[PDB]
């Protein structure tokens, strides 16, 4: 094939142009996002029961839905939690590769059929089924600076005006309102209701009658009386539209004739659907929009379009309303793409310098300049064809490929330049021979590199999805580089290069290049003399190899492991947990101090603080809240002192002084979608209907035993909340029936007043919105207020709630968890310093076996993924290692010689581990992919030395040592040229302190350090390996 | 106080070793959460016999009442902690203690049908004819629950 | 034919009929299934100690086993050879007439007194200024 | 009585059932025991 | 049933249409609301 | 109709480039393909 295109250079250009256009086309159509779909498909069923406790929600909603979640395909596990805010969330996680649309519709369909089994109040509110596994592109914040609008006023505006317009914007895949639109709030007064002998029952009944859409009919409707001329629709009673109309709602007409209206016995205003969450942005009232990227959409185009639409809305905003961007993931994607182009531009510039330093002719420096961009564009075409996207993982995959793409370009051109310099052939005849020496080897190298990376893509779950991004990108880039090396560069070499006279090594020149050529020719004789001496005493160098292999194993075990590196994302969170029974006001005072600290002591770092009172990830309530800290640009925060980790430590220590509150800061995970992914996720299951109280005692027992092993297990705590004091009220059935008071009127008056009641809908400025009746704050606070509420008996006498009720204090769960239908309690923890997560799980299983009868367990989330991933690893390494051997065995036509190549693997790994251990990094994905690439090129260097050495013995009949010494001499220059260019190419990635540095550091460190050793050791050890192996076997 | 909140948690959780250390450092035994529950209230509720004795040795109020008038004996009797009920009564617990509803330890004991505790309360002089806010006695509860064994004891 | 799409289309049309069905039929739960006509296997459950009756075993299988098996991928349909326990109120017509009561009065009383009430919270949102207490109000729960 | 979902593999589904039944057995009350009075899958496995 | 075009547009059509966001290969969406209270929201998709 | 007319120029451009590169590969020339591709307007005018 190389011969075919040496004689047909225009054909070679056509294929190169076809590849370029395919790549250029692919670049335009290719999706662009920060990360691809890593987490397995998850469908979350969300329901709401206003004024309901955790147990009411669980026993009427959660359990009923869970029992009906059958006939659904490819379900791994089901998890749910029911809390005292009246909320339930059932997450169904599916097998990796499951269609998320088919998964959601199957879950949705089973819910629909289970809807008639749920309470009427839950059916009114409805039950949402959403794909929860998806993550946010950005969070658009909406604030009011002149204090003319509340969070309810802002929320309604965003919903009524902005939401649909942003939802319609090009590339937008989902928009969640951080708040609710207005609701008609009736704030009932018990003193006024009792005065007119009325109850919440009467208020609800009246609203349902006087705020309703009534069907009438038509004038002259069919079948008509013939002769009828006009046909008109009859409009009867329609929904109310204003607070005024609701105010005029008639409740009672007295004897004297005076009228009792709704405004007489209640305050009527537009407000929120709930008041559980209080959102503040730098202390000012705030709402916002959580925007998700659509499937196949371009993140940079989508965000630009979102800002463009908000810019057109700017002239129609009320005075004080402002747009802010506390969270935006596009700066990463833009930098990830920019630094990829920058790297590969600098890479081509670096090759040019090194190519001219050694070859000293511009005609030779242009062959890699053409070949490299062609292969890169080719990769984008294969990337698109396999349905992959331009993301952080695929982008750093191409940065790790350049070392292997550059090598192919140099090796081909350098070998032609050498053959001409030594034999004195014309470029055309020289290339034919030069390619003849390497064409069989490059095909062999291609098959080996495939066997290294391809099996890595066949990992299952989350880790397999991450590896697949690097695997396909490197294997594609590698594959195309070989085709371009067997088609284009041979044709280029034969036509573009200039003839070199036999024995012209550039020692006849003057100046710098004349001096350099003499130096290098002297250094080559020095090197070949060193190998000659090394091969006289192979025995001691085999000992020196085992020290490297033992030293490698030692470092590999002691190097701390972690999936992905912690990144400065310009955003982190501050959790605020107050004691059991703590109120909204108390939690706000703590959030105000957190906000005050960050805008005072971190004025030069923090841009804004988004204070969310009422919401937590570990559970909701008035006694929880999170502050989302938004930092300034990385260029306006120099040094490690002004980084997330530094600020995180300062904040944690600063808020340690605060009393009656657990306050601490922490950085976000590298991938928000996936989650923590550091430690284990344990589920403690009630397998024999033991109950909540007994499952708590078994949990406390497991935690107590975990605390007795600090050497193995660390920070082993429950994820859920603890039991809290709750006001138990017992309605006397006998006393109720005796006074002639119905239980419905009692349970309605209580539930409506204290809990709230969603009555029906009304239309506010052509927008259908909810009508809620509830007690005015001051009449539903303390147990003394219970007695102020009256219910009318059959005889018309008003009876106080105290007359037919008795109350006491008991403890109950404000958040009840369930795993796979059964009652559960989620326990988090991690392995102690030096210990692996796998070992920590072994003990947790052992401790769990000694728990009371009927108490089971299971592994969920990252733990479920790790175990099924750990089972695959051994089989994949084995497959990978067997095929590498089989390929090299076919290449060299020997079962023995392949070992000489495979013995170089530890030479690159030692340097990577030395670099990582020294710099204080972890055994992460970027590092692990960095090792596989380092092993790739180190093997590639050795493969050519062994092939050349073997061919000299087979063809020209040279001796073992003669051929080996001749091989290393010919191989020295192209090895040094490749290594020099690639080490300088990954220099910016190592020293990078700014944005996405955690990725670049993990990439650069392992590669650079590995390349240094893989270069310096291999040139002395490869000749030893080949000689020692050849001597042993025949 | 600081130790007062730690003792409340310790007494509830049932960490005897932590309670011991807190009694030495001088943690407030009359400490109360928002609902008015002392460590003794909690210890009695969650059935921690050893801590009830330790708290009472360190001058804990045996007849402490919450914001609804319920005492540790009310809780111990209701949730069937026979050992704790005896300890409380030995240390001078008001056997006829009425909450805001007029409910007694005997009423609560009879309601869940704790036959042993009912006989212990009557031994220490429980008013068998004591009426709650609805005029219901422990006997009126027994016949309504359909507890023939409990019915015989209250005659 | 794709059985997943076949199910979706069948249910899409069933959902138009669901509201027209009697309220007793809806509350029993209508089920759409994509399975074979024949049984793949029968998983039997016995008691070698004779400690549990045919009625006790059936309830345990229904309450502790059936759901997990029904959620397993590949399981189109599961048929319980028996019945899960219910709170059986076996009415007496002689005693009902004696107190001038009917089945209507019995059903009215059960719905009223076997109820799970949502009763709100002490110091619930939106609260008054200076509120220190926040507790869930627990009214009537389901009978056990 | 378990019926095979349309298209699903008989042997793979049968294995998944035995795996789920194995997670229940430990927490059984005394005397309770699983028996296999009817299964079409053993024939398929043995026949092949 | 018995609802005018304006009433059913505000309570049904606009409530449905605002939730028809982030559907794959959606070219355009046309809908009509009439005096019989009937709503038909047609979503046309890309060829293929 | 709008879509058909908008993409028509792109379609003609890519079609010509493909035919040109195809000829260039077969004849091992840049000039011979150019001599052939110049005959296209002689046909297109006839269709018009
Ligand atoms: C370029 C040429 C290279 C082509 C590479 C082809 C990739 C290999 C395809 C198979 C990928 C999946 O790999 C597959 O994983 C499963 C586990 O899930 C293994 O199954 C495993 O089961 C248990 C798990 O505890 C192990 O004890 C057992 O040793 C092993 O067989 C399979 O043996 C393996 O084949
Ligand atoms: C661990 C730090 C990193 C170093 C990695 C190890 C490889 C690089 C080290 C330098 C290699 C050159 O070092 C080489 O050593 C051998 C030792 O047998 C010397 O060889 C020596 O012994 C042989 C006989 O055994 C004599 O014929 C020779 O005259 C004598 O010098 C070579 O003359 C020297 O050039
Ligand atoms: C967006 C579209 C980009 C891709 C479009 C395709 C690019 C085509 C570019 C090719 C022209 C560049 C080279 C100049 C050619 C050129 O100038 O042609 C004359 C030359 O002498 C080569 O032809 P010749 O040696 O006579 O042919 C052999 C005859 N036996």
Residue numbers in the entry:
A (entry chain B): 1 to 1034
B (entry chain D): 12 to 166
C (entry chain A): 98 to 241
D (entry chain A): 290 to 337
E (entry chain C): 50 to 97
F (entry chain C): 866 to 913
Sentences from the paper on this structure:
In contrast, replacement with a hydrophobic methyl group (5, EC90 = 62 µM) did not impact compound potency, suggesting that hydrophobicity is an important criterion for activity. This was confirmed by the improved potency observed with the introduction of bromine (7, EC90 = 32 µM) or an iodine atom (BDM88832 (8), EC90 = 12 µM) instead of the trifluoromethyl group. Computational data confirmed the tendency of one or more inhibitor molecules to persistently reside in a channel linking the cytoplasm and the BDM88832 (8) binding site, as inferred from the crystal structure in the L protomer of AcrB. A lower density of compounds was seen for both the T and O protomers. BDM88832 (8) interacted mostly with residues V411, L944, E947, and F948 as it travelled from the cytoplasm towards the binding pocket. A persistent interaction between the inhibitor and F948 could rationalize the observed hypersensitive F948A phenotype in comparison to wild-type AcrB. Overall, these results validate the AcrB/inhibitor co-structures and provide strong evidence that pyridylpiperazine inhibitors access AcrB from the cytoplasm rather than the periplasm. From the crystal co-structure, it is apparent that the pyridylpiperazine EPIs bind uniquely to the L protomer of AcrB. The reason why no pyridylpiperazine was observed in the T protomer may be of technical nature, where the transition from the L to T protomer may not occur in purified AcrB due to the presence of the stabilizing DARPins.
Efflux transporters of the RND family confer resistance to multiple antibiotics in Gram-negative bacteria. Homotrimeric AcrB is comprised of three protomers that cycle interdependently through the loose (L), tight (T), and open (O) conformational states during H+/drug antiport catalysis. Characterisation of resistant E. coli mutants and structural biology analyses indicate that the compounds bind to a unique site on the transmembrane domain of the AcrB L protomer, lined by key catalytic residues involved in proton relay. Thus, our work unveils a class of allosteric efflux-pump inhibitors that likely act by preventing the functional catalytic cycle of the RND pump.
